[PDB]
């Protein structure tokens, strides 16, 4: 029970985005590092309780 | 490398700084994006399988 006495800190990143102002930068040919970059969303939307 | 301010750690944030050379921009000028600016739309052939209720599109 010694693990769960002191409250652990969750590091939430600062919310910033500039797609609404300059919609020209986001177009039909996006840049991605991995080719399996849409797998995690496609998994959640199909099976949420997993 | 470590930095301190107000007796607390000062951390570096943002993107990874590169060594900008004269060649790195003018190779994109040499490239010019020479892809002829012509809206070529490629098709998708629908493929039927066991269920038939839901549709599935293939690349060719």
């Amino acid at each position: 029970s010694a693990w769960f006495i002191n409250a652990g800190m969750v590091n939430m990143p600062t919310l910033s985005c500039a797609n609404g102002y300059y919609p020209a930068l986001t177009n039909v040919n996006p840049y991605h590092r991995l080719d399996t970059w849409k797998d995690t969303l496609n998994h959640w939307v199909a099976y949420p309780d997993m | 490398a470590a930095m301190f301010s107000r007796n607390k750690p000062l951390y570096m944030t943002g993107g990874s700084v590169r060594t900008i050379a004269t060649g790195n921009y003018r190779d994109a000028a040499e490239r010019l994006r020479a892809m002829d600016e012509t809206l070529r739309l490629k098709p998708f052939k629908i493929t039927e399988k066991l269920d038939f209720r839901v549709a599935a599109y293939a690349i060719p």
């Binding site: 177009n27 039909v28 199909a46 | 012509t38 839901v54």
Partner: protein, 50 residues
């Protein structure tokens, strides 16, 4: 133009019929069927491109 008009709307509304019957958990789905097909640089995937 009357014959060219009916030819275009009949082509679109037929394909939107069998596009509405695909699950979101897939490569070419409801949201991302325009991006992969387009091989140009339009401002925004709307109007005549879709």
């Amino acid at each position: 133009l009357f014959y060219h008009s009916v030819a275009m709307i009949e082509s679109c509304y037929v394909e939107l019929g069998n596009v509405a019957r695909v699950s979101d958990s897939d490569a070419i789905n409801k949201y991302t069927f325009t991006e992969l097909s387009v091989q140009g640089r339009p401002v925004m995937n709307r109007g005549i491109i879709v």
